From a paper:
Removing the N-terminal domain comprising a 39-residue helical region followed by a 42-residue disordered linker and adding an OmpA signal sequence and a hexahistidine tag to allow purification directly from the E. coli outer membrane (OM) led to larger, well-diffracting and reproducible crystals for FapFβ. Incorporating a L273M mutation into this construct yielded selenomethionine-substituted crystals that produced sufficient anomalous signal for phase determination. The structure was solved by single-wavelength anomalous dispersion (SAD) to 2.5 Å resolution with an Rfree of 26%. The trimer interface is extensive, with a prominent phenylalanine ladder (F325, F335 and F367) making hydrophobic contacts between protomers around the C3 axis. A notable feature of the structure is the presence of a 13-residue helical plug between residues A89 and G101 that is inserted into the lumen of the pore from the periplasmic side with the C-terminal end pointing in and the N terminus out. Strikingly, the helix is immediately followed by a turn with a double phenylalanine motif (102FF103) before the N terminus loops back into the periplasmic space. This hairpin structure constricts the pore and represents a closed conformation, which would not likely allow passage of molecules larger than water through the pore. An evolutionarily conserved salt-bridge interaction between E98 and K401 pins the plug to the internal wall of the barrel. The plug helix is also flanked on one side by a specific electrostatic interaction between E111 and R157 linking neighbouring strands within the barrel lumen. The fact that we were unable to observe channel activity for FapFβ in the absence of urea indicates a highly stable plugged conformation, and may suggest that the crystal structure corresponds to a final step in secretion in which the channels are stably closed.
Numbering used by the authors:
A (entry chain B): 88 to 120, 141 to 245, 249 to 406
B (entry chain C): 88 to 121, 144 to 181, 194 to 245, 253 to 406
C (entry chain A): 88 to 120, 143 to 180, 194 to 244, 253 to 406
The structure:
Amino acid sequence: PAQSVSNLYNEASGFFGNGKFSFETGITYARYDNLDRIKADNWTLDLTGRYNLDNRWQFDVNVPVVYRESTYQSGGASGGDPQATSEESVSRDPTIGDVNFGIAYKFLDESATMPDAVVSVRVKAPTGKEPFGIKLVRNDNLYVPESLPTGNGVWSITPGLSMVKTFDPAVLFGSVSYTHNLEDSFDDISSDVNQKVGGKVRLGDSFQFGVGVAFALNERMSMSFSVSDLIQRKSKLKPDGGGWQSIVSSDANAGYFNVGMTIAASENLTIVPNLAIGMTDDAPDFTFSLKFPYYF
Amino acid sequence: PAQSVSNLYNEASGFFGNGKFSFETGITYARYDARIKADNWTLDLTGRYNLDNRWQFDVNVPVVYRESTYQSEESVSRDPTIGDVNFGIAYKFLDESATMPDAVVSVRVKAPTGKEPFGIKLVRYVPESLPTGNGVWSITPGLSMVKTFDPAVLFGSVSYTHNLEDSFDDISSDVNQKVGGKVRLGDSFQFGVGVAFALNERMSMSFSVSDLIQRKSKLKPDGGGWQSIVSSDANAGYFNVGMTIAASENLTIVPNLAIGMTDDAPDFTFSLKFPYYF
Amino acid sequence: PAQSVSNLYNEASGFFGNGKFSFETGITYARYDDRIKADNWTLDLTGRYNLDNRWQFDVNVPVVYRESTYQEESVSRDPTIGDVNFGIAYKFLDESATMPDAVVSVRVKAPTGKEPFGIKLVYVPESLPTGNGVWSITPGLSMVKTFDPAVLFGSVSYTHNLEDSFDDISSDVNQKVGGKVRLGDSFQFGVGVAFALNERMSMSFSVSDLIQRKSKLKPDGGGWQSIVSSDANAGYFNVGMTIAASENLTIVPNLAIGMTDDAPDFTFSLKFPYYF
Ligand SMILES: CCCCCCCCOCCOCCOCCOCCO
Ligand SMILES: CCCCCCCCOCCOCCOCCOCCO
Ligand SMILES: CCCCCCCCCCCC[N+](C)(C)[O-]
Ligand SMILES: CCCCCCCCCCCC[N+](C)(C)[O-]
Ligand SMILES: CCCCCCCCCCCC[N+](C)(C)[O-]
Ligand SMILES: CCCCCCCCCCCC[N+](C)(C)[O-]
Ligand SMILES: CCCCCCCCCCCC[N+](C)(C)[O-]
Ligand SMILES: CCCCCCCCCCCC[N+](C)(C)[O-]
Ligand code: NA
Ligand code: NA
Ligand code: NA
């Protein structure tokens, strides 16, 4: 099996079957863009360890490290004039996000009739800086966060399914997953500087799926085209002594079109560049990533 | 031969020569965001008859399911209802040779069978219902061209939609008023260009772009002169990535992604079509 | 080397090393969308002298036609130049088994287009600009290498804008304010992959991103102040082809999808490089 084919399957399935222990370093850049303008430059360094057992089971742990920069622009401004200034920027120095781990089980091996199929579960912990309690600090009509979050503040569990099959030369693949967020509590759920309100949060659950095609171009390179869509239900807050109330407009549909490659730098090292184009306003405008899975 | 080649030509030309009588079941999902979020599904039912690889006759019945959500949130929906029924005649006037392209000329007649937008009232403010068609007759002559330059298959198409003037009992969306009036929906010009590839015996892949340009629409209330609706013009651009997959010798699966490039296009459109050859 | 391969390299590198002289005619349409819709056409005229597949000298004259509609009133610019520019390029690495084709270049752009500063709001602009009003110098790097059948390529450049002055920096019809302007510098890069499909055709997929720093103004008798929201990130996804019409004439269609709000929705272009 050519390296390109192996690397392709790893990328499409999330199941790294060539080896035994592997470590992937990833760098990702993502770009986002009372009436005010927010521009965000977000970098994520991903550190992922994987153990593949007999091409059947896989265990992984991922530690994301988040660097962020948001710029807030008002047109308040200076003072009361609907089209004047105003620029405030806020940043987060490199900090851990939400640590997570996954178990995957390959329940179908590809044959003439069957796909490679992998079932998986992913458990994510709330280790990142949560968004709840972050205060908006007041130019007169421009309020800006005192800090930026690096995670969503809750535990979550994500069972998933991946399928891959070669119809030479096209490799078709698809995937689907469901994220259940666990309810949790916080000392402060208010972003009012003047107040402190304890409360609980239920983050809306989400459904994710993707399909795509990939090609092995030569011994060392593959290319991939895919689409994906994430659908998130609205989120709810319960202040102490209050009831559950939904946050209007917290629901989301984040669609992406992805073009990527796999490049075998050696037997052990792959370079995986990818572009994800945001198709909806809930997605970043675009996302560039470069991943370096290394096999040992 | 190969199936992939046939299926791709069908896709690129709109002329299905597989091929005598065929029935195509299509499912389409389209996503819009204005605050209004729209999830729109269309089940397409299309019958086609290809006569001697020269003439093609078809009827299409679209069935529309819609959910719009309005955020202060209130939601409005349309249960599965028929849209604008239409039929088409196509004539292949050039057959592909070393020098010639496959070229098809066509006309499509669309009837106002869907629930029209004109009576629909804004109720304290969301619509009481969602339309399923545009409320007018339209006629669309079109042109398609396809040619293989091995292994690239280049294609392009162009069409013009003339909308017929029509009259309605109510043109107003004010709940308190009823105003009869006439409507001229702005005509539109559509074109696209692309490239496709046969990957193997059974599969093709396609990349294309298209753009629709619609002129302004006009209203005449009873008594009453013609007024342009100054913001009714549109430019809807799309980038398409698609496949054809020969499931058997009778069934093709056609997945397509259309990415909206402009604000008048849905954010994205996913479709899955299943042409079946009897 | 097949014509497709040559045309491919020319497109990816900007270095047209298969002839002494070339002239490229390009037509570009771009679409942008109180509401404003803009239809913008640019006719590009570019002459190149390639010396021994080692050096290249070029001049580009863009001719700009523009139409903006404000919602309804419309404003237009009849065909007018163009920030004229020229470039010098040097191929410092020739592709071998180990090395890429690599070209270093410098591009000098002059402020010949109608500048935006001083254009009055009358509410709609009285006119539309065709250039940015300043000199700029852009050193750049291009790299291309075949890993059969994939041709990988990439490019990167930095634009330094020269400070300049204008008689009027205000768009207020009632005022005239002289001032100096430092246009924010920019960093540009792209990467992509291309394929020779046959003797005569190639296809390309690429991405690019332009990052522009904020600009600053000094009105006369005032101090330097940064122009909020003048910073920009214009990202593009490109799908393109090269088609050999003759051994001299290539047709180059390209679609550039804007990925950010600082980019046009989309850009369709058609370029016709001609080797003499
Ligand atoms: C970039 C979007 C391109 C679409 C990706 C294709 C995968 C999604 O398709 C869903 C249905 O496909 C099932 C394929 O079934 C195989 C049939 O072939 C059997 C005969 O050889
Ligand atoms: C996303 C795609 C971007 C670039 C696609 C450009 C496609 C250029 O194709 C033009 C289409 O024209 C179709 C006609 O083909 C037949 C040519 O007829 C000439 C006879 O030799
Ligand atoms: C750029 C981030 C995209 C997020 C949307 C997710 C799309 C596909 C979801 C299924 C993933 C399942 N998998 C491969 C983990 O098993
Ligand atoms: C993983 C490859 C990353 C590609 C490089 C993208 C650079 C984006 C830089 C944005 C931040 C710079 N700036 C000027 C806004 O400060
Ligand atoms: C995806 C929505 C497309 C809307 C605009 C389409 C422009 C195509 C013009 C003529 C169509 C002929 N064709 C390709 C169907 O054979
Ligand atoms: C040549 C055959 C053309 C297709 C004919 C299909 C009839 C449509 C019946 C579907 C009914 C839909 N609905 C939901 C309103 O009940
Ligand atoms: C309104 C018409 C709807 C479509 C007509 C479908 C007819 C079903 C025929 C089933 C038998 C087909 N076959 C090839 C398996 O024999
Ligand atoms: C046409 C839009 C401009 C966007 C800026 C980014 C362009 C990156 C590609 C530069 C190509 C340079 N060169 C010398 C290789 O041709
Ligand atoms: Na959107
Ligand atoms: Na737009
Ligand atoms: Na944007």
